[PDB]
Amino acid sequence: FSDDQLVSMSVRELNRQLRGFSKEEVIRLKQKRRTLKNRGYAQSCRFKRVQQRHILESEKCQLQSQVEQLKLEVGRLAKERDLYKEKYEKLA
Template sequence: MVTDDLYAPLSPCPIPDISDDELVSISVRDLNRTLKMRGLNREEIVRMKQRRRTLKNRGYAASCRIKRIEQKDVLETEKSHEWIELEQMHEENEHCSREIENWKKKYNALLQFAAHNDIPIPPELEGC
């Protein structure tokens, strides 16, 4: 279940000249060095690191959502192609069944014609 506080804005950044994009892209080592050089207290450092983690998690979640949507689209396309192929196979089966029935009718008509005209049927064709 998605709650409103999931997308709530973050508290203001303790260091105004570090953008959220920079905060997410900077390495941990560089972030630690930057925070120490600025002389932030322990609470501000913890808040900055938590902000960074929250921003990164939001990025990962957005990336997963996009990937899931793309995969769903791919699977729906595949499913659609499979249904089309299945329908074509059903149509081909029906066509083959009709063709078999026609051949059976022709064969039976030939048998009747042969019987009516006293034409012997070769033994290999009698059981067909």
């Protein structure tokens, strides 16, 4: 009957408890349940939107940190290649 109980019980459990009620009330209670559930759906939707904003802004940092790590790696190899190439061309 109350909002917390109405939103908690299943429509299967609802129809059984709704037995003995006017057809006017049954459709009225069922639509009250939907409203309360949409309230919860809204909370999840807004929360998800936030989490997705964070994992994007976080992935951006996980990539920037990787890019900088890789630019250092090419600097080591480029220098190391130049070393071998200079030593090689010297021997023709």
